[PDB]
Amino acid sequence: KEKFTSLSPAEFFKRNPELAGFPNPARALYQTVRELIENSLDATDVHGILPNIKITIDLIDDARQIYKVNVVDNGIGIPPQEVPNAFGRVLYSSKYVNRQTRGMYGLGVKAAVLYSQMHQDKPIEIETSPVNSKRIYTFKLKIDINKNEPIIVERGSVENTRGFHGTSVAISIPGDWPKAKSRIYEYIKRTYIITPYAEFIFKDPEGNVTYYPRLTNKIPKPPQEVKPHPYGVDREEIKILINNLKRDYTIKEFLVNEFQSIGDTTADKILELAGLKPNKKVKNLTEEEITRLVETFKKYEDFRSPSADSLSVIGEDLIELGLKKIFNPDFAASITRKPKAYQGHPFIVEAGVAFGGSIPVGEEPIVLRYANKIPLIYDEKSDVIWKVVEELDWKRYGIESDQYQMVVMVHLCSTKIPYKSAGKESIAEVEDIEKEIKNALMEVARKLKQYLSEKRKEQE
């Protein structure tokens, strides 16, 4: 009766597509679109390239409701040896490195490929040309779910005359355009508003074409790989850090070199609290001494914040400008908080508030959520951002009536966003994140008070 069996990562997601954001054809179409766009953006702005991204969705089969999604970008491309695994091996990524990107699981595109395979028979099509490559490399791929490995259906190359570079991805999937339409449009519009150095073109299944022109040629400094912040690094992470050392570091040397925010004196203070010999060889840490390091990191109250430069923010100015373009308010304000850390990861919370003007009258605020520059559209009431907004008492900040015109926007960015599911539509209840979102909203809420106070004496 009990037969014990194993699954591959590919079989796991094929059996549970709702875990990756593929619960139904409408959400699947939306998910496939944003995974491709986010890959294209990670392939451009992370590498100092002004993104030029084209999105096409065609209805291929009316009766069967199969759509072909094609995204083309001018990004860094993919080395041809890596393409099969990049697109056809679940849990394969170039972004497992400690660095702020949109992608993070090494699942995304493969979830769409699995969903594609589940329901129709055309392979995914990849065309790619790395910087300086004299060839465009072409592929048609499927995934062997049992082995979790790519099946190469076609593989070829052509000479690249108009010597340009980037990647085109096309995937055919079940979809529901009429149901996904408003959200696909909103996803692209919100991305665009916060990514003014990007240019998008969107051709939809009805044949509408929408142009989103570049507004500036200045890209924010690209996020880089950074060292972990000590606060919240766990025991398994300590072991990984040790196992990856080239040099025979002592524990002291380990602390100042492998982490952010640890100078020579901070190192000493930690080693004392943790009860570790500074000169002992870190390769020799016992199971117990690792426990003592981790607990010390967790308790130490005098850690400097991580470098803000670790991350890529939207910015106070862009945030306020955005709130004025869309909402045409009587008042807006924003803050880009100083960095904090959670589980070894630097993060910044930004928050913005708008009030009055063309903002609809309602019983709750309109809440706008972003994480690593991605607009979140689904599952809003499950989000920690919504929880904090809900729990805050807006009467303590001027909100007189139970009916008001208010927009609240929160952006979380980090080397790691803790999402509730691999679908990445909502942020989990991580304690340090929840507290800082609350502190951030309070700062901007105080500014709203100062206005609603001055504005009240006018009616008085």
Ligand X SMILES: Nc1ncnc2c1ncn2[C@@H]1O[C@H](COP(=O)(O)OP(=O)(O)O)[C@@H](O)[C@H]1O
- Tell me which residues touch ligand X (CB under 6 A): 2, 35, 39-40, 43, 73, 75-76, 78, 86, 93-95, 103-110, 167, 169
Report whether 87 contacts 167 (CB < 8 A). Answer: no
108 lines the binding site for Mg ion (CB under 5 A): yes
Classify each residue of 318-343 as buried b or exposed e, where b means 16 or more C-beta atoms within 10 Å of its C-beta. bbbbbbeebbebebbbbbbbebbbbb
119 lines the binding site for a copy of itself (CB under 8 A): yes
230 binds, among a copy of itself, ligand X, Mg ion, none (CB under 5 to 8 A by kind): none
| 33 class by beta-carbon count within 10 Å (0-12 exposed, 13-18 middle, 19+ buried) | buried
39 lines the binding site for Mg ion (CB under 5 A): yes
Alpha-carbon span 43 to 40, nearest angstrom = 5
Work out which of 56, 70, 120, 210 binds a copy of itself, going by CB under 8 A.
120
Going from the C-alpha of 145 to that of each of 7, 88, 110, the distances in angstroms are 9, 9, 11
186 lines the binding site for a copy of itself (CB under 8 A): no
103 lines the binding site for Mg ion (CB under 5 A): yes
What's at 44, amino acid-wise?
A: T
229 lines the binding site for a copy of itself (CB under 8 A): no
Work out which of 121, 159, 248, 363 binds a copy of itself, going by CB under 8 A.
121
Does the annotation place 108 within a ligand binding site? yes
Q: Identify which of residues 420 and 455 has a Cβ nearer to Mg ion in the complex.
A: 420
Q: Give the nearest distance from C-beta 163 to ligand X in angstroms.
A: 17
Alpha-carbon span 438 to 440, nearest angstrom = 5
Alpha-carbon span 212 to 201, nearest angstrom = 6
Does the annotation place 110 within a ligand binding site? yes
Q: Identify which of residues 106 and 228 has a Cβ nearer to ligand X in the complex.
A: 106
167 binds, among a copy of itself, ligand X, Mg ion, none (CB under 5 to 8 A by kind): ligand X
Report whether 43 contacts 119 (CB < 8 A). Answer: no
130 lines the binding site for Mg ion (CB under 5 A): no
Work out which of 54, 59, 70, 105 binds a copy of itself, going by CB under 8 A.
105
3 binds, among a copy of itself, Mg ion, ligand X, none (CB under 5 to 8 A by kind): a copy of itself
Report whether 24 contacts 42 (CB < 8 A). Answer: no
Q: Which residues are 172's β-sheet partners?
A: 68
439 binds, among ligand X, Mg ion, a copy of itself, none (CB under 5 to 8 A by kind): none
Contacts of 317 (CB under 8 A, 6+ apart): 334
Cα 394 from chain centroid (whole Å): 29
Cα 410 from chain centroid (whole Å): 14
Q: Give the nearest distance from C-beta 224 to a copy of itself in angstroms.
A: 9
The separation between the first and the last C-alpha atoms of the chain, rounded to the nearest angstrom, is: 77
161 lines the binding site for a copy of itself (CB under 8 A): no
Residues that bind a copy of itself (CB under 8 A): 1-9, 12, 14-16, 18-19, 23-24, 27, 47, 64, 76, 82, 85-86, 89, 91-97, 105-106, 114, 117-121, 145, 234-237, 287-288, 290-291, 294-295, 379, 381-382, 416, 418-423, 426, 428-431
Binding residue numbers for ATP? 39, 73, 93-95, 104-110, 424
